[PDB]
Design a protein around this ligand. Sequence first.
Ligand SMILES: *[C@@H]1O[C@H](CO)[C@@H](O)[C@H](O)[C@H]1NC(C)=O
Ligand SMILES: *[C@@H]1O[C@H](CO)[C@@H](O)[C@H](O)[C@H]1NC(C)=O
Lengths: 48, 48
Amino acid sequence: NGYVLRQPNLALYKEGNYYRITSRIMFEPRIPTIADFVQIENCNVTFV
Amino acid sequence: NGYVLRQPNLALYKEGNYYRITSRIMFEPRIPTIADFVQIENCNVTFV
Ligand SMILES: *[C@@H]1O[C@H](CO)[C@@H](O)[C@H](O)[C@H]1NC(C)=O
Ligand SMILES: *[C@@H]1O[C@H](CO)[C@@H](O)[C@H](O)[C@H]1NC(C)=O
């Protein structure tokens, strides 16, 4: 299983050791959580 | 409690033994999860 985001306007990034997901239009950062993801069986290697 | 979807553009269906929820505008299928539902007390019999 590979996970993706529920809507496009967000984007992950590696801020430091931890990972932070920000908006695409502003630099405001938001905490990661499990509710923000969605499941798809086929894994693409190109992801984290 | 009866559950419904967080936004209208989705739709459940019984693909096989398991249930799959797809987009209303494309046939792309997405995995079921609990985060995609919402609770309402009154149960309508007309649902699954
Ligand atoms: C999936 O990974 C392949 C690896 O070669 C990459 O070329 C492709 O762009 C990726 N597709 C995506 C991320 O949708
Ligand atoms: C609720 O179920 C009743 C069962 O008679 C049905 O007639 C009605 O259309 C349903 N309402 C919904 C699904 O909003």
